[PDB]
Amino acid sequence: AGAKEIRSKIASIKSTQKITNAMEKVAVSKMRKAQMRMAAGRPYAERIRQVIGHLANANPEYRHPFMVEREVKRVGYIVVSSDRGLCGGLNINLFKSLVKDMSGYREQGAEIDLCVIGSKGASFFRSFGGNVVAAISHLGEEPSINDLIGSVKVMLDAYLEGRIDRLFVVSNKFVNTMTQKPTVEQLIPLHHWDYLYEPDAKSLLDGLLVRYVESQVYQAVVENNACEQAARMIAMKNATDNAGELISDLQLIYNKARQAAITQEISEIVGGAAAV
């Protein structure tokens, strides 16, 4: 109604628009910090895969339980999610893909076990009733691989004990700065010279494979953090743009109120002067 309150609303929204415009640049800076951490983890995992591939071919007498598939009715999932909000659909599109693939197993009569990383995933399963077997949350923007050891071990022991038949990791892939793709990726069911194998080749394999699965989960967690900052950049850009529309609508209402006040005052001045 009054021209005083409309100015207060315009100022309130303008103050908010200034900080959402700042947060967009902060999200980009954190996205670049995450992209360099993704690149630093690649030279380790590619070498472990190269060693695993050679050893498994050079020693046919042994096949680790991770390298053979058991066709039975129980599955496991590691779900990666954010701790903070302000994401333009990052968790929503991921949970939609998780539910789509989980239903195929529920309908096929198979049981499901869940491992959860991040507070948003924990809140989703806590509210909808998911049977989480292991969970972790409040990890930094720069996570450490030692924090993942526990959650990954619980999921690996269940496969070694024959309780889990297949294990998958659910997270977002960094296609480009404007696109985050939600994906479900399998984990457990993975030149003519030999190494000297100082300790037993079978013992080395039993150790290298555990480091490989942990390195895959760590890379999935670090890449999801880069996707989270990219989703936040877009969300703060949209919030800045929507504030601009609200300021524009209020400015038209303010100008209409400004003109009406001058017209009323002149009507009162002329009316009073005609009576005197």
Catalytic residue IDs: 87
Smallest gap from residue 134 Cβ to another protein (A): 4
CA distance 271 to 274: 5
* Least distance in angstroms from the C-beta of 174 to another protein: 20
Give contact residues for another protein (rule: CB under 8 A): 12, 15-16, 19, 23, 44, 47-48, 51, 88-89, 92-93, 95-96, 99, 102, 106, 112, 122, 125-126, 128-136, 144-146, 149-151, 153-154, 157, 211, 238, 242
Amino acid at position 225, single letter = N
**13 within 8 A of 243, measured Cβ to Cβ:** yes
Which CB atom, from 142 or from 268, has the smaller least distance to another protein?
142
Please say which residue, 241 or 268, places its beta carbon nearer to another protein.
Answer: 241
What's the full length of the chain, in residues?
276
C-beta of 60 vs 129, nearer to another protein? 129
Specify the residue, 57 or 275, whose C-beta has the smaller distance to another protein. Answer: 57
Nearer to another protein, 133 or 247 (CB): 133
CA 214/CA 127 separation, integer angstroms: 29
As beta bridge partners, residue 117 has 80, 136
Question: 3-class DSSP state for residue 93?
Answer: helix
State how far the Cα of 55 lies from the Cα of 201, in Å rounded to an integer. Answer: 7
Min dist CB 20 to another protein, Å, is 8
Read off the tokens for 240.
């800045």
Q: What are phi and psi for residue 167, nearest 5 degrees?
A: -125, 135
- CB of residue 189 vs another protein: minimum separation in angstroms? 22
Nearest-approach distance from CB 268 to another protein, in angstroms: 35
Tell which residue, 151, 160, 186, 162, has the closest CA to residue 74.
Answer: 162
For another protein, give the closer residue by CB, 10 or 257.
10
Which run of H or of E encompasses 179?
strand 179-186
Q: Is 138:119 a contact under the CB 8 Å cutoff? A: yes
Q: How far is the CB of 106 from another protein (least distance, A)?
A: 6
* CA angle at 186 for the pair 152 and 32, rounded to the nearest 5°: 75
Sheet containing 179-186: give its strands across.
132-136, 111-117, 74-80, 166-176, 179-186
DSSP H or E segment with residue 106: helix 90-107
